């Protein structure tokens, strides 16, 4: 198939909740090396972010019950095995999408826009990497998500305005990683009062093809700073 | 904690 | 490894929501030759009913948009198809030969009336017709097992007087037909609620529910 | 239009 078939079976995929088979097709489009539309660019990242999502969500189902099983050995080892197979997928997945982004998708991008997208889903797969590092290795990690996202941060703070959703989405994401990972509450909270004022301080910037997500992320900051005081 | 993933 | 870790894997694989991790599972299980306890039976019916459902799901909105279409639906469909020849292999070769009680025989019979179900939702040639008959043949020495040998308020029992009555109007084309076992199934279990046990009634009662929704729907 | 499937 080209560019064309590809792009409508990943719609398809997409419909029939076949995430895998979604994401194959959008890795291969992005592996033609040409700079993804915008249409390109959120069904590539809603691919990966539903396969990624997968393992996530297994992972800590199944690592809780690793936890929850101290003093019944047998239990607790068919759950640490369990645990490692589903962190060796998740791994292999987040290895995946940031080797994308390092070949194609960060070089390629020419427009600001473009480069805080792609730079915050850097972050964004490091930190899942995080999320599950031990070691003698979460370090090394933690700071590629962190400087992945700082870099981001200061283009969005330059170049988008605050209402614009990929910049409070890049601020939500940030400050999440903050909070869960740097076990920082006040910076994460700091970070997402910020953004939250900010737009709240703008509203009128909004459009009508990104009000919604706007005001829909704004919620979602809100949130976390109520559940995080 | 609510992540860009929880948009709809 | 052994049965029983093959089944506590297939309950990790279920709290995890990874389904092809619980089928296998539970298939492997089922290929030892010995029969399922009910446990095991459940989790078996439970792994693969979310791994087939899963390609029903998505082969509904393929072929409802159909192209590239076309060419992917037939994609899942053979999946979908490859899935229910495995279940009701292992249906052929283990569980229902090996079924010593009346209510696993009822169980698997179901089972396999379910599966060829299943199968003819997405047969279009003049192979559905052999499938169709496939299914109905499965459904009813199943329900001739259960009249004979359970009471009218026992799960397996309505669940398949459940099931069977979708086949005829889903497949069949046989409203009335449909209409009159889901009635019967429900009026012969509320003829004799005394009959239901401690750990049954909650599904007993749950699944009457069902067959009345069916019979007001159909009715309409 | 339900099956057991529901539970």
């Not at chain 1, 305005?161 to 939500?172: D, E, K, V």
């Given at each position: 198939?080209?560019?064309?078939?590809?792009?409508?079976?990943?719609?398809?995929?997409?419909?029939?909740?076949?995430?895998?088979?979604?994401?194959?097709?959008?890795?291969?489009?992005?592996?033609?090396?040409?700079?993804?539309?915008?249409?390109?660019?959120?069904?590539?990242?809603?691919?990966?972010?539903?396969?990624?999502?997968?393992?996530?969500?297994?992972?800590?189902?199944?690592?809780?019950?690793?936890?929850?099983?101290?003093?019944?050995?047998?239990?607790?080892?068919?759950?640490?095995?369990?645990?490692?197979?589903?962190?060796?997928?998740?791994?292999?997945?987040?290895?995946?999408?940031?080797?994308?982004?390092?070949?194609?998708?960060?070089?390629?991008?020419?427009?600001?826009?473009?480069?805080?997208?792609?730079?915050?889903?850097?972050?964004?797969?490091?930190?899942?990497?995080?999320?599950?590092?031990?070691?003698?290795?979460?370090?090394?990690?933690?700071?590629?998500?962190?400087?992945?996202?700082?870099?981001?941060?200061?283009?969005?703070?330059?170049?988008?305005?605050?209402?614009?959703?990929?910049?409070?989405?890049?601020?939500?994401?940030?400050?999440?990683?903050?909070?869960?990972?740097?076990?920082?509450?006040?910076?994460?909270?700091?970070?997402?009062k910020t953004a939250f004022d900010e737009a709240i301080a703008?509203?009128?910037?909004?459009?009508?093809?990104?009000?919604?997500?706007?005001?829909?992320?704004?919620?979602?900051?809100?949130?976390?700073?109520?559940?995080?005081? | 904690?609510?992540?860009?993933?929880?948009?709809?």
């Amino acid at each position: 198939m080209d560019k064309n078939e590809l792009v409508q079976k990943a719609k398809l995929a997409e419909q029939a909740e076949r995430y895998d088979d979604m994401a194959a097709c959008m890795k291969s489009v992005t592996e033609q090396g040409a700079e993804l539309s915008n249409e390109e660019r959120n069904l590539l990242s809603v691919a990966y972010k539903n396969v990624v999502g997968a393992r996530r969500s297994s992972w800590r189902v199944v690592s809780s019950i690793e936890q929850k099983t101290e003093g019944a050995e047998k239990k607790q080892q068919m759950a640490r095995e369990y645990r490692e197979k589903i962190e060796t997928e998740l791994r292999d997945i987040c290895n995946d999408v940031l080797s994308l982004l390092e070949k194609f998708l960060i070089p390629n991008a020419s427009q600001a826009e473009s480069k805080v997208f792609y730079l915050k889903m850097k972050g964004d797969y490091y930190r899942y990497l995080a999320e599950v590092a031990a070691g003698d290795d979460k370090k090394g990690i933690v700071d590629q998500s962190q400087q992945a996202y700082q870099e981001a941060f200061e283009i969005s703070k330059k170049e988008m305005q605050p209402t614009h959703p990929i910049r409070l989405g890049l601020a939500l994401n940030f400050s999440v990683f903050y909070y869960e990972i740097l076990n920082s509450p006040e910076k994460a909270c700091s970070l997402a009062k910020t953004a939250f004022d900010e737009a709240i301080a703008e509203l009128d910037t909004l459009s009508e093809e990104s009000y919604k997500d706007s005001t829909l992320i704004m919620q979602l900051l809100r949130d976390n700073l109520t559940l995080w005081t | 904690s609510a992540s860009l993933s929880n948009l709809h």
